[PDB]
Design an enzyme around this catalytic site. Structure first.
Site, PDB file in Angstrom:
ATOM      1  N   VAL A 215       1.008  -1.780   0.019  1.00 47.89           N
ATOM      2  CA  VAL A 215      -0.218   0.263   0.161  1.00 47.89           C
ATOM      3  C   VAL A 215       0.526   1.010  -0.117  1.00 47.89           C
ATOM      4  CG1 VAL A 215      -2.307   0.976   1.559  1.00 47.89           C
ATOM      5  CG2 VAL A 215      -1.895  -1.139   1.262  1.00 47.89           C
TER       6      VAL A 215
ATOM      7  N   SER B 157       6.646   0.900   5.988  1.00 48.52           N
ATOM      8  CA  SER B 157       5.866   0.237   4.787  1.00 48.52           C
ATOM      9  C   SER B 157       4.907  -0.429   5.275  1.00 48.52           C
ATOM     10  CB  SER B 157       7.413  -1.184   4.585  1.00 48.52           C
ATOM     11  OG  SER B 157       7.946  -0.420   3.871  1.00 48.52           O
TER      12      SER B 157
ATOM     13  N   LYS C  20       1.757  -4.034   8.570  1.00 49.28           N
ATOM     14  CA  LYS C  20       3.113  -3.261   8.562  1.00 49.28           C
ATOM     15  C   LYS C  20       4.492  -3.271   9.396  1.00 49.28           C
ATOM     16  CE  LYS C  20       3.264   1.457  10.896  1.00 49.28           C
ATOM     17  NZ  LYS C  20       2.925   2.665  10.532  1.00 49.28           N
TER      18      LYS C  20
ATOM     19  N   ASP D 136      -1.539  14.628  14.979  1.00 48.26           N
ATOM     20  CA  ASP D 136      -1.492  14.716  13.066  1.00 48.26           C
ATOM     21  C   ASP D 136      -2.518  13.884  12.471  1.00 48.26           C
ATOM     22  OD1 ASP D 136      -0.822  15.020  10.132  1.00 48.26           O
ATOM     23  OD2 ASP D 136       0.487  13.111  10.672  1.00 48.26           O
TER      24      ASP D 136
END
Ligand SMILES: Cc1ccc(-n2nc(C(C)(C)C)cc2NC(=O)Nc2ccc(OCCN3CCOCC3)c3ccccc23)cc1
EC number: 2.7.11.24
Length: 326
Positions: free
Chosen positions: A26, A28, A44, A141
């Site tokens: 997608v 890493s 992930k 964020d």
């Protein structure tokens, strides 16, 4: 490597158990189908998780944090593992969750959402943040690409790890004592973009970012400007000319009056007067969805362990335990 296998995706080695089949990067991060769990899953691989002390803390925190937080509208761990049979050859970490489909950008890009859809999307985003804030955690964020959406318009918050578009002023101004409502500013920037179908404050730089925020929300008082910025950061705002406050109704033309009302309570320069995640769900915009019972808070998050100096090997071992104990 006892039932694991090796690939090279993103030009890096990926050792995973054989139940995970068909890894498509997608970002890493890779897609996959889980054979045992019989569903679509994302994975992930953490980047060199123990190369540095900070990486070791961030590796620990992420794991500790996803395990602690368990809510519908938040990312949750399906599995964690390592291709490591001992602490010596413990060098790689992999996190695994359900595939939530797309991010929030894809939804806006493709299909201009109704006021019905928008209601439900922000509702979940707040209901989710109410959970995270109650834990004693800040996102810092919150933005479209850190928010996954299922095709059923199911929402989940995450931290992938420009930002400044959805960033609160006091963070840019280095207040260094900002609270949870920094994210509530972000929600407003996201929610506005849902309605208009385009970023509210797409600042091309740091200054242009502030110039766009200062046009809509207006110039703050010296009293209010002194409680959202360092002594150095104030000269950036004073440099800018005097600009009046704009009425949101004129911006968000043909928007739901309720939606406009709520944006006025989110996009405020003073953090003390921004709406709470909890309060915001009460708002009459979410009257179709709000349920006081089915809006749970989270358990207090224990910082004790993290809030202590330790060597890498301690973060290394402490992490190994948290991996295995899952
Ligand atoms: C150091 C660090 C510490 C904490 C975090 N952190 N903080 C949070 C909060 C804010 C919700 C508490 C969440 C997270 N961590 C994450 O949200 N981690 C992840 C991000 C993106 C991913 O993949 C995205 C790709 N794709 C999107 C669509 O759905 C499937 C996954 C992931 C895929 C599998 C496993 C974890 C993923 C992050 C880093």
């Amino acid at each position: 490597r006892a039932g694991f296998y090796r690939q090279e995706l993103n030009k890096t080695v990926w050792e995973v158990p054989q139940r995970l089949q068909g890894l498509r990067p997608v970002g890493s991060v890779c897609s996959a189908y889980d054979a045992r769990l019989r569903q679509k899953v994302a994975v992930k691989k953490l980047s060199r998780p123990f190369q540095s002390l900070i990486h070791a803390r961030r590796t620990y925190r992420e794991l500790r944090l996803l395990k602690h937080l368990k809510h519908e509208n938040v990312i949750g761990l399906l599995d964690v593992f390592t291709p490591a049979t001992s602490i010596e050859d413990f060098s790689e970490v992999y996190l695994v969750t359900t595939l939530m489909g797309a991010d929030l950008n894809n939804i806006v890009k493709c299909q201009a959402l109704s006021d019905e859809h928008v209601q439900f999307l922000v509702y979940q985003l707040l209901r989710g943040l109410k959970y995270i804030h109650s834990a004693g955690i800040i996102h810092r964020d919150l933005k479209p690409s850190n928010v996954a959406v299922n095709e059923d318009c199911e929402l989940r918050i995450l931290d992938f790890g420009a930002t400044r578009w959805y960033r609160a002023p006091e963070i840019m101004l280095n207040w260094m004592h900002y609270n949870q409502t920094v994210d509530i500013w972000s929600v407003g920037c996201i929610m506005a973009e849902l309605l208009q179908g385009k970023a509210l404050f797409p600042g091309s730089d740091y200054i242009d970012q502030l110039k766009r925020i200062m046009e809509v929300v207006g110039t703050p008082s010296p009293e209010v400007l002194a409680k959202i910025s360092s002594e150095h950061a104030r000269t950036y705002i004073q440099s800018l000319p005097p600009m009046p406050q704009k009425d949101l109704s004129s911006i968000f033309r043909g928007a739901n009056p309720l939606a406009i009302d709520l944006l006025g309570r989110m996009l405020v320069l003073d953090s003390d007067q921004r709406v709470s995640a909890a309060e915001a769900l009460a708002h009459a915009y979410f009257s179709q969805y709000h349920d006081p019972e089915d809006e749970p808070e989270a358990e207090p998050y224990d910082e004790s362990v993290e809030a202590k100096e330790r060597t890498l090997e301690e973060w290394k071992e402490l992490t190994y335990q948290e991996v295995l104990s899952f």
